[PDB]
Amino acid sequence: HMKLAEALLRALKDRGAQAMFGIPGDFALPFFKVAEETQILPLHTLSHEPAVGFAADAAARYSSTLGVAAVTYGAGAFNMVNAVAGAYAEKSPVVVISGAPGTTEGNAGLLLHHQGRTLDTQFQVFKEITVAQARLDDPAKAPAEIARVLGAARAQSRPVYLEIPRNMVNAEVEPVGDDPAWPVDRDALAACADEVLAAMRSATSPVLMVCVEVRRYGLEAKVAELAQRLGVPVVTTFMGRGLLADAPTPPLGTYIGVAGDAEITRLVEESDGLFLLGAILSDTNFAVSQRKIDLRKTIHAFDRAVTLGYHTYADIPLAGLVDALLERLPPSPHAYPTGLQADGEPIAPMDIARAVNDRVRAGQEPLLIAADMGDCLFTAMDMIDAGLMAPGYYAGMGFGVPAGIGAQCVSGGKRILTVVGDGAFQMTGWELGNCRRLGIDPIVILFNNASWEMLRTFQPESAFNDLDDWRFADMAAGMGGDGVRVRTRAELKAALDKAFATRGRFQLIEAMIPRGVLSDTLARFVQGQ
Amino acid sequence: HMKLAEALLRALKDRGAQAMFGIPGDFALPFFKVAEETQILPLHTLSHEPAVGFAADAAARYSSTLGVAAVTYGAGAFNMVNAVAGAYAEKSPVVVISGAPGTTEGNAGLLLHHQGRTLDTQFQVFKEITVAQARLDDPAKAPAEIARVLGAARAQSRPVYLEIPRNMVNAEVEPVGDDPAWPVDRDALAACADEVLAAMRSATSPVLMVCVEVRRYGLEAKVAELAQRLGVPVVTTFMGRGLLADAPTPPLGTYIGVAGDAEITRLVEESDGLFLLGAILSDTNFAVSQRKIDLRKTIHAFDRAVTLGYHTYADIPLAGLVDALLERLPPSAYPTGLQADGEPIAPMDIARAVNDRVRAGQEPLLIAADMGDCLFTAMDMIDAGLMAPGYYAGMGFGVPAGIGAQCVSGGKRILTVVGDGAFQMTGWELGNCRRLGIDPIVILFNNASWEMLRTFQPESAFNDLDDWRFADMAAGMGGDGVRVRTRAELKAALDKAFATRGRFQLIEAMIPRGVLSDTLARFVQGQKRLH
Amino acid sequence: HMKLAEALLRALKDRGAQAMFGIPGDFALPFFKVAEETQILPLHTLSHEPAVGFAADAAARYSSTLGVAAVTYGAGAFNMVNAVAGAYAEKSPVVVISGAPGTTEGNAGLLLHHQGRTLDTQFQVFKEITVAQARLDDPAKAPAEIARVLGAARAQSRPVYLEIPRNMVNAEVEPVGDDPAWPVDRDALAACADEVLAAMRSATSPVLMVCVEVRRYGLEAKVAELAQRLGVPVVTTFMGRGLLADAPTPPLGTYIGVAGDAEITRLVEESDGLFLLGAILSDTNFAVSQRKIDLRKTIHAFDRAVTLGYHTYADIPLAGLVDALLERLPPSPHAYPTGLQADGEPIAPMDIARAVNDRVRAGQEPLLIAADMGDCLFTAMDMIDAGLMAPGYYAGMGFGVPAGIGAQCVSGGKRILTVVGDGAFQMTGWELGNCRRLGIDPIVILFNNASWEMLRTFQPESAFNDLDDWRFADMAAGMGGDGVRVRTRAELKAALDKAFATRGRFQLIEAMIPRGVLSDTLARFVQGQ
Ligand SMILES: Cc1ncc(Cc2csc(CCOP(=O)(O)OP(=O)(O)O)c2C)c(N)n1
Ligand SMILES: Cc1ncc(Cc2csc(CCOP(=O)(O)OP(=O)(O)O)c2C)c(N)n1
Ligand SMILES: Cc1ncc(Cc2csc(CCOP(=O)(O)OP(=O)(O)O)c2C)c(N)n1
Ligand SMILES: O=C(O)C(=O)Cc1ccccc1
Ligand SMILES: O=C(O)C(=O)Cc1ccccc1
Ligand SMILES: O=C(O)C(=O)Cc1ccccc1
Ligand SMILES: O=C(O)C(=O)Cc1ccccc1
Ligand SMILES: O=C(O)C(=O)Cc1ccccc1
Ligand SMILES: O=C(O)C(=O)Cc1ccccc1
Ligand SMILES: [Mg+2]
Ligand SMILES: [Mg+2]
Ligand SMILES: [Mg+2]
Incomplete structure (x- = not known):
């Protein structure tokens, strides 16, 4: 057994978190106290909550791991909605940890400073901008909830939300276990990879277009090898600018439609084998296209799915697909x-x-x-x-x-x-x-x-x-x-x-x-x- | 312009409805009055609401068209929840028409007989057993709503819910137009048909297994032709027993696993090309199998989708796929x-x-x-x-x-x-x-x-x-x-x-x-x- | 410890249930088996589910206790929605017990006979027509859930819903405890009773109008005593016809507005002290009024609240109020x-x-x-x-x-x-x-x-x-x-x-x-x- 706050910090560290950013408030003081005295995760404070969120998000993007943002109830959490919504959109796994009233507070006939319409209003708001949530108000369940929520953040690469009643920070709990496993059908993956490879091999001018998920799941090195083995050029999306910076052979450039380089734009838009690897289908990435791009004629791998040939393969993780493609391939730019x-x-x-x-x-x-x-x-x-x-x-x-x-x-x-x-x-x-x-x-x-x-x-x-x-x-x-x-x-x-x-x-x-x-x-x- | 109730009865008849089954109640008496007088649809009354639902449902199944069940608020509608859930489960487009309180009633500080916890309670219940619902409380919008709802019932082949305040029954409205269009991507359809056909041709022992949707979308004659051109045996699911009853070559039999003919079962479970056409993947159809069938290795067309080779083609109507297949194929004991x-x-x-x-x-x-x-x-x-x-x-x-x-x-x-x-x-x-x-x-x-x-x-x-x-x-x-x-x-x-x-x-x-x-x-x- | 099905039946019997009505189905067979072999509650079967619901409802009205209706998943339960909605409207505490798929069923890739759109569809529908619900899919929690749900049925006098996965019927659980308690503020009750009594005492032609709740909470005898001590006439609502049949002094009659007796209608409608005791404010009870009745000028006790003088006293149980009024009063018709x-x-x-x-x-x-x-x-x-x-x-x-x-x-x-x-x-x-x-x-x-x-x-x-x-x-x-x-x-x-x-x-x-x-x-x- 160990204190819940301590179990949580260790669980984050075990999963790669490198630091915790935050701004305290009375509801979160007990938790910050544990974070500072244990020093399990380095504690960095900032001035205004938006920066806390943005910084957690950057730490997460930087090391392709979980980011940690700790705030107080209401005044803190609601002040971070914008940075979290942004992390959700750009698929960055920021763990939002908010202090909250104790489990027995709020039953005195009084409204509590920082609460919304109801004590649960904040929880409701964060449901809209996170992929999983849990109120750690039951020591018995806390460990499973923690593993479930953090497990979801790592698999989906999006923010999650943990609410901690202040009277629970030091409650005794068992250590947090491993993330729940997300099954992957070997036959489906095999078939998907086989069809993708065949589509790239039959294309006359194939293009591998890399985006966010490639970084989120740490696939830059493996994906440079894939381009290498496939013998095809790599171009990033606008969102994916900066990817494969360490690649022996850098990408040819960044596709920005009518606003980017003309040759890259032509290469991309005239491709008969455009592989959108982990891309966000945003206006910022594709509305700038000179010639209307038929997304249905592309190969799209995103959100644990792969779409091509007018059909979709569900439950296919990007990492799984990249490894599958590599297994089927034998070994072996715009001026600044x-x-x-x-x-x-x-x-x-x-x-x-x-x-x-x-x-x-x-x-x-x-x-x-x-x-x-x-x-x-x-x-x-x-x-x-x-x-x-x-x-x-x-x-x-x-x-x-x-x-x-x-x-x-x-x-x-x-x-x-x-x-x-x-x-x-x-x-x-x-x-x-x-x-x-x-x-x-x-x-x-x-x-x-x-x-x-x-x-x-x-x-x-x-x-x-x-x-x-x-x-x-x-x-x-x-x-x-x-x-x-x-x-x-x-x-x-x-x-x-x-x-x-x-x-x-x-x-x-x-x-x-x-x-x-x-x-x-x-x-x-x-x-x- | 015409009365709403009349415009609805015509819209229903324009779509093949043949009759209206129902039991009246004060909140519906107006609606029933119009029906009885206009005679746009024969009005058949029965003894208890469950039968109203089942009959409307049977009628839709018989003619592969819409079914019409008219009941009163609360005591009528709620008593038909079971038949409607069943029609929903078995993909029969039953159109539930319920009489409701006038748009101005319920504002005298009083509760109305037949109402649930709230006046919208009945509506919330039916949302759970219908694919579309509409409260016809705005004459200006009734026409388009009738169109949207009846269209969903036709396209998805499931029940729909229409709630009519009694002071709206005889309200002037424009006539109802056609259902909205669910445009199908021709390119996707083409890719889908080519892949399904390729899979059937590479199989050494293909089997075309038919189920509910085949009748629902009136595809029995086209499926029988499809089987003929493909040169493959046709078998029905347990649910599909009775399909292709009037085809030149009837199905080989009905699959029921350990409970059916051993030969049919063998044929089905050994098939390397099992095409589940419009089939419900239920325990009744497949939990009977002699050996668990790996459904991911079959070709499954159901609910406007088609799944095979571990992937799915969305927005592919069963009828669209059958016709697409037939365009790629030249003609050929109790x-x-x-x-x-x-x-x-x-x-x-x-x-x-x-x-x-x-x-x-x-x-x-x-x-x-x-x-x-x-x-x-x-x-x-x-x-x-x-x-x-x-x-x-x-x-x-x-x-x-x-x-x-x-x-x-x-x-x-x-x-x-x-x-x-x-x-x-x-x-x-x-x-x-x-x-x-x-x-x-x-x-x-x-x-x-x-x-x-x-x-x-x-x-x-x-x-x-x-x-x-x-x-x-x-x-x-x-x-x-x-x-x-x-x-x-x-x-x-x-x-x-x-x-x-x-x-x-x-x-x-x-x-x-x-x-x-x-x-x-x-x-x-x-x-x-x-x- | 004991089997869950057995704990449930005993809990119902302990709370006054006199019988269980039902129609089985494969999902409910295990539960019916326990009901028949233990005979804790007499088991009566009927032909069609509507009758099961209506009969449970009548047994409940008859003895002013809990009624028990047991059905199978889907085909059974959905076929009882109308009788249950009716029991909800007329405040009869019918306990709906439905069999359901086991906790591990439904994960074989197959749809299960009797299910709605989703396995949870039925639960969702019954939420609309019951005051409490619980799926008894966790032995550890079952006893508390049972006491919570049955407790709600008795307090609110309305139907409740219990869903039992068939693999849980024989799961070992601890005996069911007492109903959760619903606090009552003594000062509020005292003040409410004082204001009600004063309103009845200042009225020139006071009328005590009795309705359903009087029977639901077993207050007929006490309420006849109240009319007796207050020295006022008793008239029933249309809904409340049949109340106080055993009263030494029967009610004067039943108020049916323009459709009832003229003298009762005049007495009711001209009253300056009309006490609507536990009445449903329905059209069937009041739309038939000859002269528009101002409900705001009445004293209304219903749904654990009391309204009069344009204001409401919350959390006031009818029984509590009747006892409170009796405590402040010293001891002491239409032809057929x-x-x-x-x-x-x-x-x-x-x-x-x-x-x-x-x-x-x-x-x-x-x-x-x-x-x-x-x-x-x-x-x-x-x-x-x-x-x-x-x-x-x-x-x-x-x-x-x-x-x-x-x-x-x-x-x-x-x-x-x-x-x-x-x-x-x-x-x-x-x-x-x-x-x-x-x-x-x-x-x-x-x-x-x-x-x-x-x-x-x-x-x-x-x-x-x-x-x-x-x-x-x-x-x-x-x-x-x-x-x-x-x-x-x-x-x-x-x-x-x-x-x-x-x-x-x-x-x-x-x-x-x-x-x-x-x-x-x-x-x-x-x-x-
Ligand atoms: C939180 C938020 N509020 C408003 C906006 C809307 C906006 C998009 S671009 C821009 C002007 C930025 O001026 P800046 O000096 O920063 O750089 P530059 O344009 O090159 O001169 C605004 C206000 C956004 N995107 N986010
Ligand atoms: C489940 C349900 N469906 C319809 C109705 C609507 C109705 C209210 S009254 C009535 C006629 C009853 O005829 P009955 O022979 O029983 O007695 P009588 O009128 O004196 O001749 C109906 C159909 C209700 N209330 N409940
Ligand atoms: C509305 C509803 N309530 C209960 C049930 C549960 C059931 C499934 S089978 C059966 C026995 C049927 O006896 P029946 O005499 O009709 O035919 P047979 O078995 O050959 O003797 C029941 C009660 C279902 N399916 N639907
Ligand atoms: O600690 C905080 O977050 C505060 O806002 C301070 C505070 C604490 C209790 C009541 C009002 C303000
Ligand atoms: O997340 C982004 O904004 C990117 O462009 C991906 C990225 C992040 C960090 C280093 C390199 C690329
Ligand atoms: O017409 C119905 O559906 C009825 O149940 C009759 C009725 C109408 C108004 C009040 C009470 C009963
Ligand atoms: O809907 C059913 O129950 C079927 O089995 C399909 C059917 C319906 C009517 C005739 C032939 C088959
Ligand atoms: O037992 C029931 O309620 C049934 O409906 C019988 C049944 C059981 C399993 C599959 C199909 C029908
Ligand atoms: O519940 C009813 O329908 C009543 O009228 C109340 C009642 C119930 C049983 C006996 C006497 C009165
Ligand atoms: Mg600027
Ligand atoms: Mg009669
Ligand atoms: Mg029998």
Whole structure:
């Protein structure tokens, strides 16, 4: 036997969790107390719950494991609905742990601070944005519930929800067992793999298109081998940008329809054997298509199913399929913008892409990139990376900075490059004030165009997309980092070199960008939509 | 523009409805008044709501069309839940029409007679046993709703629910248009047909097994042609007994595993190309198997889907698949000898009697059977089709079904087989024959017992029933009854029943307790294994 | 420990159940086996499930206790929805026990005979017509579930639902404990009783109107004492006809608005202190009011609440209130149609009322009366009785005959008088064929007018209300009873005398009644509606 809170933390750690992010409240104090005193999982606090969710999500994307977000009842949990809905959409297994009233509280005739219409209102809301839930209000059942919920998060790669009455944190329970098993029919898998391979082999111009699930289930290496053995080109989706960064043979590029490279777009759209491997069928990934794409003519492996030839194979895990394909195969690109003119001219999005890329070509091992939504994301699309995480489908802003924070918190010393615009920084960039206590020194390039540019690009006439010029670099000092505003390419270049040479605190390079000055990609992308 | 009730009755007739069965109640009197006056559909009344449902259901089964059951709010509707769940389970499109309180009633601080906990309670209940429902409380929208709902009933071949406030019965509305269109992807259909056909051709011993949907969608003639072009034997499921009764080449037989003909069973379970066409995967159809059949290795077309090779093709209508297959293909013993002596009557003697008449020239009658040894015996009868609750297995279906079918059979007589247990539930409906202008022949297997249950658990006393003199009670209901105890009397009684028209003919056959068809005996043991 | 089925039967018996009615099916065989071999509760089978429900309901109304109805999965249970919905409406605590597939059945890839869309479909349907439900699929929990469900049936006086997987019938469990307790605030009760008494004392013409709950909770004797101590007249509702039959001072009559006695109607409608004690606020009870009745000006005690003076007292049990009123009070009629002319003239409804009433006045102790819906009920309204049960609010037909059967099954030798019309007899009158095996000999007076008269009375023009003339008396013999058709008052009188003098089998007096010939009450009642 052991305390329930302790059994839970150990169960998470046993399943790969590397840390726990959170913000306490009276309902969660007992649980945080156990998390801090046991130190089973490193405890990192943030300033506002959205960042807690985003960071757990990034830690999960970074290591392809479970992310852990702990909050208090109501004020905490409801403040994380947006980040969780986003993790659900982009299939990131974030474990939401919320404190709640004790099992005997609420029967005094009084309404309790933080509750919704009913004490169960919060549970009801999270049912909508998670794949499994459990209220750990029965010691006898807790272990099975925990294994069931965490088991679901790992299999479905989506968020789960655990509610812990505060009087149960220290209740004695048996250790948590293994995840329930999800049966897989060997004959179905065999047949599916046989039909998929045959479809790829009969195609004249086959294309392997990789997306999120490839990372979620840790299949990047195996999938590079599959492309290798099949002898076909690999292209990522917009959502899947950054996949196979460590592959001996990198993908040919990223498919962005009318907004991406013309040859990749033609290769993808004219393919008679397009294998959408673990892809989200989103507008962001396919609405930008120049020529209407017939999804029914593709091979689609997603959500533990495989569809092709107008029919679906149920209960087929991506990992199982990849292994099955490999077993049947015997052993055995778009240019990056470069050459930045570090002079006295104004900074444009692509100049930032060039600066980054030039240091790498010059010898700097690339950095994993965390990106927020805005032109910063369409610009990162042309950056050299060691992986990339961004809200490519949910597209909610605020992800960038806390994602870089969460990822670096578990990166074992490797720095994370963060790209975010002024609108997004206003929302959550402030979380950087926590870098000192957390012990990380991310490099953040803030695209300051004093505007919600993407929206102006969408509806140029409106005035509400105008924003003041916040002196983000001047405020960096107050949050404990080094901030520098840059207006010229030479200042940009120099600032970037200083940032990389300076560790110990966050480096905010505030890049002044004129309104109307965008990356090549964004413009066309918007019009495509 | 026209009255809602009238627009509904026309929409029902436009879709093949042939009659409306029902029992009235104050909340429905208006609706019934219109029906009676407009005569858009013959209005047949019965004694108890369960029969209303079964008859409407039998009528839909007989003509492969919609069935219409009209009842009153609460006391009427709720009393039909069992028949509707059964029609749902057995894919019969029964259209339930219920009278309801006026759109303004129930706002005087008072509860209304017949209502459930809430006025919407009945609606919530029916959502569980219907594929679509609609409360016709908006004249502007009634037409389109009638269309959506009746269309779902037709496409999915299951029951639907229509709730009519009594102050809406005579409300002006536009006429009802066509059902919405469920467009089928031609490319998917093509891929599906090609794969199914390839599988059938690569099999060395293919078998086409037909079940309910074949009749529901009126595909019997096309399936018989399909089998011919494919050159494959046709077998029915237990539920499908009676299918292709009027085909040039009838099915080889009916599969019932350990309880059926050993040859048919062998053919079915050894097949490397078992095509389950419109089949319900029920314990009644397959838990009888000699050896567990691996259903994932069959070709299964059911509920607008087609599964084979461990994958499924969604949105593929059974009729669409049959036609697709036919476009890819170029054209190309019953028990007898009743010994009419003084020996007691056993179930099989009854099949022999029925079959000898057919062999001597009698055109076979369609059979309506209830659940009990009557059904298992009917498995051995020559028929012009047969309807029974072979999956839901709910008793009481027998007599009402026979009645419902004969009401729409344009003169053809229906033979009904039923046990004493089931007759006690709905056999009494025969008292409506005169008024309905029908005279069905009813063979009542009377063993003073719930014999099928005794077979499951012989040690129990509660299966011993009293002896009711059903034949003696026939007269009071307007029919001719005769109780038979010997095989000779059985034979005489049957000839007289066929020779006598104008009144329903009831032949009450006394079967000794503990005497049951081998089929029933083996079926029960077969099912027991599943516990 | 003991077998679950056995624990359940004992729990029912401990709570007053006197019998179990049912029809088996393979899913329920194991349970019926236990019921028959243990004989904890006498087992009575019927022919069709509707009668099972109606009979359980009557047994419950008869002894003011729990009624027990046992059926098989699907074909059995769904066939009882109407009788159960009726018991729910008229507040009769019928315990529905249904057999179901074993906990491990249904996982073989096969659909199971009797199931609805899903295995849980039946459970879902019964939730709509019961106050509590439980699937006894966990031996550990079974005892608590049983006590919770049966506890709810007794407190709320409505049907409950128990589903028993067949593989659980013989599972070992601990004996069932007591019902969970439903707290009652002493101060609230005290205040409520004080305000009610004061309202009755300040009224100039107070009227105590009794309805169903008075019988359901066994308050007839105590309520007669209350009227006695308060010094006020007692009138029943239409639904409550038959209440206080054993009261030293019988009620003044039954309130049926424009369809009842004029003086009772005036007394009720002009009352400044109308106490609706345990009444159903139905159209059948109040829509017949001559003068619109302001329910808000009344005192209403129903469903564990009391409303008066535009306000409601929650959680006030009727029994508690009656006891409270009694504690604050120190110690201390409409004529019956009679004189039947037993001559050669045709039989009319009221003649039947007179025949019955004359035997009683002549010395025959009245019989409890079971009535179906139709003119038979409006006629029984003018009969002398030892109590009366009828679907006075739900108004569903088919209740009559099986109700008389169920009641007599638990009447300990007392005969039950049943009144039913031809339409209703066609539905369930056939259940009489079971009287011999069950050992009862009810007297049944069938009003044969070859018609659904009530409906013709409602819409005279229609032809579909015409019915053939079934020779019910001629068919009685086949069901093992004595049947006699009567056309003249002299035949009626004589038939009734023969019936009472003949015990050993059911006596069916088929009274031929001309169409259009009704009781006085029905005509006006219909027009009132
Ligand atoms: C939580 C949330 N609220 C609003 C929006 C809607 C939006 C999509 S893009 C954008 C403008 C972003 O301006 P930014 O300075 O960050 O970068 P840039 O456009 O290149 O100038 C907004 C407000 C989203 N996606 N999420
Ligand atoms: C509405 C309903 N309630 C109970 C049952 C359960 C049952 C299945 S079989 C059977 C006995 C039938 O006796 P019967 O005399 O009719 O025929 P036979 O067995 O050959 O003697 C019962 C009670 C079903 N299926 N449906
Ligand atoms: C289950 C159910 N279905 C229909 C109805 C609707 C109805 C209310 S009254 C009546 C006619 C009854 O004729 P009966 O011969 O029984 O007695 P009488 O009218 O005096 O001639 C019907 C059909 C109800 N209430 N319940
Ligand atoms: O601890 C919290 O989350 C709070 O909001 C503080 C608090 C605690 C109890 C009542 C009101 C506020
Ligand atoms: O999740 C994303 O946003 C991705 O693009 C996938 C990914 C995540 C982390 C490193 C590389 C790719
Ligand atoms: O018409 C019906 O369905 C009835 O049950 C008759 C009725 C109508 C109004 C109140 C009570 C009974
Ligand atoms: O619906 C049934 O019970 C069947 O067995 C199908 C059927 C119905 C009518 C005639 C032939 C087959
Ligand atoms: O026992 C019952 O309730 C039945 O309906 C009999 C039965 C049992 C198993 C399959 C089909 C019918
Ligand atoms: O429940 C009813 O129908 C009543 O009228 C109440 C009643 C029941 C049994 C005996 C006396 C009164
Ligand atoms: Mg901006
Ligand atoms: Mg029998
Ligand atoms: Mg009548």
